[PDB]
Amino acid sequence: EWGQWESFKQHYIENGRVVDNSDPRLITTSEGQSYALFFALIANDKKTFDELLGWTELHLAGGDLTAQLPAWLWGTQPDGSQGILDSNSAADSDLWIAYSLLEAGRLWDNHYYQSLGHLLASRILRDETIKVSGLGTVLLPGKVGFVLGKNHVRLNPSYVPLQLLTRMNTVFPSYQWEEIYQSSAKLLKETMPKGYSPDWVEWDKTQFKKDSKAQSVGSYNAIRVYLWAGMLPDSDPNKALLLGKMKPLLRVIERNKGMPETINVLTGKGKNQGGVGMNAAILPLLSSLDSNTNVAEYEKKIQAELPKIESDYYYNSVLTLFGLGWYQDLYSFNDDGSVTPKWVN
Numbered sequence: 068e069w070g071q072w073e074s075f076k077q078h079y080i081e082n083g084r085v086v087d088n089s090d091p092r093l094i095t096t097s098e099g100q101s102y103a104l105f106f107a108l109i110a111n112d113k114k115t116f117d118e119l120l121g122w123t124e125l126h127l128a129g130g131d132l133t134a135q136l137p138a139w140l141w142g143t144q145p146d147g148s149q150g151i152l153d154s155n156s157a158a159d160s161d162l163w164i165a166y167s168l169l170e171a172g173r174l175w176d177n178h179y180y181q182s183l184g185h186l187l188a189s190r191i192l193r194d195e196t197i198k199v200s201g202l203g204t205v206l207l208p209g210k211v212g213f214v215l216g217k218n219h220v221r222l223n224p225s226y227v228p229l230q231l232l233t234r235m236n237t238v239f240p241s242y243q244w245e246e247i248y249q250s251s252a253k254l255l256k257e258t259m260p261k262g263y264s265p266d267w268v269e270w271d272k273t274q275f276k277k278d279s280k281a282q283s284v285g286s287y288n289a290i291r292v293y294l295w296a297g298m299l300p301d302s303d304p305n306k307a308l309l310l311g312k313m314k315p316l317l318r319v320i321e322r323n324k325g326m327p328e329t330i331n332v333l334t335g336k337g338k339n340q341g342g343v344g345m346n347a348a349i350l351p352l353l354s355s356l357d358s359n360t361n362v363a364e365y366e367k368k369i370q371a372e373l374p375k376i377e378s379d380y381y382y383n384s385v386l387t388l389f390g391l392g393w394y395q396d397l398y399s400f401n402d403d404g405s406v407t408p409k410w411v412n
């Protein structure tokens with residue numbers, strides 16, 4: 068029913084795990100699992116959803132997702148065995164997994180999925196959030212390694228889709244999730260002086276500062292900011308504020324026909340060509356604002372490039388699933404952060 072999803076399963080999923088073969092360790096990430104769970108839900112694919120969930124729990128979460136956040140990285144170890152390569156969590160993926168479970172629970176009337184999504188979400192609060200001066204409670208990028216000093220944290224704009232955060236608060240209200248929505252909105256709006264979001268940025272007590280490691284680069288992480296924002300319902304007051312800053316991006320598309328591999332968020336100047344994944348990632352945004360780009364023809368170009376990412380290009384494939392899937396009306400987000408797949412109505 069969703070051709071691109073059927074292709075993705077064939078070429079990227081092996082017995083419940085999403086494989087990124089660009090790493091010679093033939094890795095699976097909690098990110099890959101999280102996106103595949105979401106896509107399986109959008110596709111009304113209960114069987115694959117179950118397979119993905121089971122693999123995630125067994126291999127990344129010690130057989131119990133109610134007991135711990137999943138490890139983010141799994142694959143071939145130096146001795147040839149397969150196992151966890153990094154036991155740290157990745158909060159963006161934790162959030163996508165919790166969201167997909169909550170939404171699958173609602174859409175499929177599956178009380179287990181509802182409960183599991185809830186218990187995972189509660190653990191995200193426990194294990195990878197912290198309250199800092201001025202910004203309040205933030206979602207940290209992982210359970211360890213992102214607290215850099217007193218009231219000083221390293222954050223990642225792409226990790227916090229406002230629609231997912233809205234959803235955390237709408238059936239079981241939570242002062243913590245409300246605070247995280249607010250700090251995330253502030254993070255997004257205040258670190259894009261030219262309408263471009265960095266991959267990483269620090270909050271140091273009283274202000275945002277250039278990330279000491281990643282500097283001012285916006286690249287593969289950050290391209291998702293435009294993706295999530297372009298798919299917000301206009302009920303979210305932050306959508307208009309974020310999109311109001313993105314005229315430079317639209318001009319980049321007019322002139323260069325796509326976003327660059329890396330962009331300097333302070334100057335708006337970019338390096339290299341970004342690729343079909345990044346082009347799909349900006350498609351919802353492109354469809355939502357005025358520019359000289361013919362959107363229909365832009366989408367046709369993306370479609371023409373799909374055979375080239377049939378295999379061996381995990382990340383471009385998930386970006387195209389998100390962006391083309393949305394453009395082709397396969398799913399939309401609602402005012403309460405929930406998602407309505409095409410198959411519902």
Ligand SMILES: [Cl-]
Pocket residue numbers: 406407408411
């Ligand atoms: Cl619905």
Ligand code: NI
Pocket residue numbers: none
């Ligand atoms: Ni019920």
